[PDB]
Each structure stands twice: as structure tokens, then as C-alpha cells.
Design an enzyme around this catalytic site. Sequence first.
Site, PDB file in Angstrom:
ATOM      1  N   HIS A 193       3.720  89.856   3.366  1.00  0.00           N
ATOM      2  CA  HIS A 193       3.096  89.162   3.157  1.00  0.00           C
ATOM      3  C   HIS A 193       3.105  89.464   2.153  1.00  0.00           C
ATOM      4  CE1 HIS A 193       1.585  88.705   7.018  1.00  0.00           C
ATOM      5  NE2 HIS A 193       1.270  90.253   6.978  1.00  0.00           N
TER       6      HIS A 193
ATOM      7  N   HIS B  19      -1.642  96.042  -4.755  1.00  0.00           N
ATOM      8  CA  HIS B  19      -0.794  94.344  -4.102  1.00  0.00           C
ATOM      9  C   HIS B  19      -1.035  93.801  -5.354  1.00  0.00           C
ATOM     10  CE1 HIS B  19      -4.470  93.848  -2.410  1.00  0.00           C
ATOM     11  NE2 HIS B  19      -3.931  92.525  -2.549  1.00  0.00           N
TER      12      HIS B  19
ATOM     13  N   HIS C 273      -0.563  89.142  -5.914  1.00  0.00           N
ATOM     14  CA  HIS C 273      -0.297  88.123  -5.442  1.00  0.00           C
ATOM     15  C   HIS C 273       0.924  87.397  -6.265  1.00  0.00           C
ATOM     16  CE1 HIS C 273      -3.579  88.831  -2.194  1.00  0.00           C
ATOM     17  NE2 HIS C 273      -3.323  89.709  -2.845  1.00  0.00           N
TER      18      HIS C 273
ATOM     19  N   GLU D  74      -4.921  83.850  -7.470  1.00  0.00           N
ATOM     20  CA  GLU D  74      -5.588  83.864  -6.446  1.00  0.00           C
ATOM     21  C   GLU D  74      -6.369  82.719  -6.667  1.00  0.00           C
ATOM     22  OE1 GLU D  74      -5.737  87.066  -3.452  1.00  0.00           O
ATOM     23  OE2 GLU D  74      -4.438  85.358  -2.232  1.00  0.00           O
TER      24      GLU D  74
ATOM     25  N   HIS E 163      -4.204  93.144  -7.940  1.00  0.00           N
ATOM     26  CA  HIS E 163      -5.414  93.828  -7.048  1.00  0.00           C
ATOM     27  C   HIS E 163      -5.535  94.966  -6.632  1.00  0.00           C
ATOM     28  CE1 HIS E 163      -6.056  89.517  -5.198  1.00  0.00           C
ATOM     29  NE2 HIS E 163      -6.282  89.289  -6.625  1.00  0.00           N
TER      30      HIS E 163
ATOM     31  N   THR F   4      -8.817  88.188   1.269  1.00  0.00           N
ATOM     32  CA  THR F   4      -8.613  86.947   0.145  1.00  0.00           C
ATOM     33  C   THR F   4      -6.779  86.954   1.573  1.00  0.00           C
ATOM     34  OG1 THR F   4      -6.362  87.624  -0.846  1.00  0.00           O
ATOM     35  CG2 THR F   4      -8.529  87.102  -2.015  1.00  0.00           C
ATOM     36  N   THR F   5      -6.650  87.922   2.653  1.00  0.00           N
ATOM     37  CA  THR F   5      -5.752  87.377   3.669  1.00  0.00           C
ATOM     38  C   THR F   5      -6.579  87.431   4.758  1.00  0.00           C
ATOM     39  OG1 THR F   5      -4.887  90.000   4.482  1.00  0.00           O
ATOM     40  CG2 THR F   5      -4.384  88.787   2.311  1.00  0.00           C
TER      41      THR F   5
HETATM   42  N1  LIG Z   1      -6.391  89.911  -1.908  1.00  0.00           N
HETATM   43  S1  LIG Z   1      -7.232  91.525  -1.000  1.00  0.00           S
HETATM   44  O1  LIG Z   1      -8.723  91.078  -0.696  1.00  0.00           O
HETATM   45  O2  LIG Z   1      -7.488  92.999  -1.673  1.00  0.00           O
HETATM   46  O3  LIG Z   1      -6.258  91.837  -0.088  1.00  0.00           O
HETATM   47  C1  LIG Z   1      -6.173  92.386   0.294  1.00  0.00           C
HETATM   48  C2  LIG Z   1      -6.608  93.988   0.610  1.00  0.00           C
HETATM   49  C3  LIG Z   1      -6.773  94.869   1.830  1.00  0.00           C
HETATM   50  C4  LIG Z   1      -6.303  94.682   3.323  1.00  0.00           C
HETATM   51  C5  LIG Z   1      -5.516  93.740   3.141  1.00  0.00           C
HETATM   52  C6  LIG Z   1      -5.750  92.401   2.561  1.00  0.00           C
HETATM   53  S2  LIG Z   1      -5.803  93.373   5.092  1.00  0.00           S
HETATM   54  O4  LIG Z   1      -4.692  92.832   5.674  1.00  0.00           O
HETATM   55  O5  LIG Z   1      -7.042  93.261   5.856  1.00  0.00           O
HETATM   56  C7  LIG Z   1      -6.276  95.103   5.274  1.00  0.00           C
HETATM   57  C8  LIG Z   1      -5.765  95.587   6.049  1.00  0.00           C
HETATM   58  C9  LIG Z   1      -6.824  95.805   7.582  1.00  0.00           C
HETATM   59  C10 LIG Z   1      -7.131  96.909   8.452  1.00  0.00           C
HETATM   60  C11 LIG Z   1      -7.559  96.179   9.597  1.00  0.00           C
HETATM   61  C12 LIG Z   1      -9.051  96.285   9.884  1.00  0.00           C
HETATM   62  C13 LIG Z   1      -9.251  95.205   9.373  1.00  0.00           C
HETATM   63  C14 LIG Z   1      -9.703  95.261   8.098  1.00  0.00           C
HETATM   64  C15 LIG Z   1      -8.298  94.939   7.395  1.00  0.00           C
HETATM   65  C16 LIG Z   1      -6.462  95.616   4.273  1.00  0.00           C
HETATM   66 ZN   LIG Z   2      -5.091  90.877  -2.916  1.00  0.00          ZN
END
Ligand SMILES: NS(=O)(=O)Oc1ccc2c(c1)S(=O)(=O)C(CC1CCCCCC1)=C2
Ligand SMILES: [Zn+2]
Length: 256
Positions: free
Chosen positions: A61, A91, A93, A103, A116, A195-196
Amino acid sequence: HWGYGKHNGPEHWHKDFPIAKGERQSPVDIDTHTAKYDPSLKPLSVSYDQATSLRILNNGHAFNVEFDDSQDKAVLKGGPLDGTYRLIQFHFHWGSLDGQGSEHTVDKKKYAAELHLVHWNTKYGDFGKAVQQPDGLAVLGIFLKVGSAKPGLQKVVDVLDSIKTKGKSADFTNFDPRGLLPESLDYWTYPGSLTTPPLLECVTWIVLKEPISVSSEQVLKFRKLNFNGEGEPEELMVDNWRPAQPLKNRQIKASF
Ligand SMILES: NS(=O)(=O)Oc1ccc2c(c1)S(=O)(=O)C(CC1CCCCCC1)=C2
Ligand SMILES: [Zn+2]
Ligand SMILES: [Hg+2]
């Protein structure tokens, strides 16, 4: 599974993750004329001097630069935040073109990318427990525009060759995230979400007003990344951003 294309993108996410149509979804448009200065906000405190990066991972992603968070090394506090938030990863976007990629938007203006920096509230013990809390995370958001090269980003740019496809990772130690920050810490803040998918509503957003500039050739290399795994048809990692979501009477507050 979920992605950013027409058949699996932000318009489809609600089916697996109904919270997508929730009351505090991110990102949002920041209407600069509706956002109010908040005198109750404390000074923002970004303490990254002791940060320990470990590796960089293409997750299909985006790419995550990961940090050692077993101790209170790189932390965020102050502003709207109560207590201490540990840096776990960052990371970006970005877009297929310079006129899109961020975003969050500012009076509907889209930036070329958005950085972010993700942090979890240490009172909750681990990241997995934090994401189950309304005040579990704090994400520091930073807009990227195209102009001059950001020296502090080049080490990231140089390593993308090594993590082109989904699942690839590379050692990425001794990287200093202080090099990615703009001069001013003026910011907007609102309660929001990841946001994902899974889109959990656990984030206090802190979006810096001042963008950083990165060179065209720096952004171009982001766009060379692949969404796919090794040995598969090439699917360029571009436009991995969710568009602005309904504010729903939430209030965006300014630090300035
Ligand atoms: N843009 S953002 O909101 O800061 O993006 C993310 C930052 C960290 C994480 C994600 C998005 S994500 O892919 O949902 C993630 C991993 C998941 C870990 C497994 C349990 C569910 C919670 C999140 C971390
Ligand atoms: Zn992000
Ligand atoms: Hg939550």
C-alpha cells in the site's frame, strides 16, 4: 483484498469495514476560515533526538520506516495530547501527479504528498491495545510540495530500489526523522481515524500548516515503487491516498 484501484478502493472499503461511514473518519478538508484558534492547546513537543529506526518495508500500500518503540526514545507530547505518544513508524501517501497525493486538504487544495508519523499512547502498553481506544494514537501530518530537494529525505529515496515490491524490506538503521520536519510547528488538530482499513477511530490528528518541499526527482522515485509482489504484472504504487471524508460537526482547532 483492499487497495486503491477502482474495484477495491476507498469507495468499496465500507463493505468489509463499515466504520468507513463513521462519525470520526479521516482524512478531512481543513477549512482554514472555520478552524478556530484554541488557547487551551499546550505547546507541541516533538522529541526525536533518540529515535532508533530499524527497517523499511513495502507493505503493498505504501512503505513504512519502522522504529524501535520498546522504550520512550522518539516521542510526541503537548498540543491537544494528554501524556506521551511513542513513534512506531512513518509512511507517505502520494499521487500519480504533483496536483494530487495528500490525504488532508487545505481549503480543498491537494498537495503532492503527505508524510504521516504514527505514535501510540504509552498508557496503553502496546500499539495493538492503543488502536482500541479513542485516544490511542496521534499522527503528525506533514504536507509535501514539489520544489527544492529535502536533504533529510534522500536516504529514504535511495533505498526504495531495494524494496520495490510487496513484502520486500531492507535494513534502515540510524535514520533521523528530524530531517523531515518543516521550520514551523503551527498545526491544526481534530479527532479522527486511521486512513486505511481497518479505519479505526483512534487518532488525534495533528496536521502541520507549513509544508516541506521535495524535488521532482525525489517524488518520481516514490512513483517507481510497485503495489504488486515480485514477479507479478507491474502496478505502480501511486495514488495511495483516501479522499476527504465528512467532518460531521467535529471541530478543527488551530494552534496559531
Ligand atoms: N494514514 S494512517 O492512518 O496513519 O495510516 C496507518 C498507520 C498505521 C497503521 C495503519 C494505517 S494499518 O494498516 O491499519 C496498521 C496495522 C493494523 C494492525 C493490526 C490490528 C488492526 C490495527 C492496525 C497500522
Ligand atoms: Zn497515512
Ligand atoms: Hg479507537
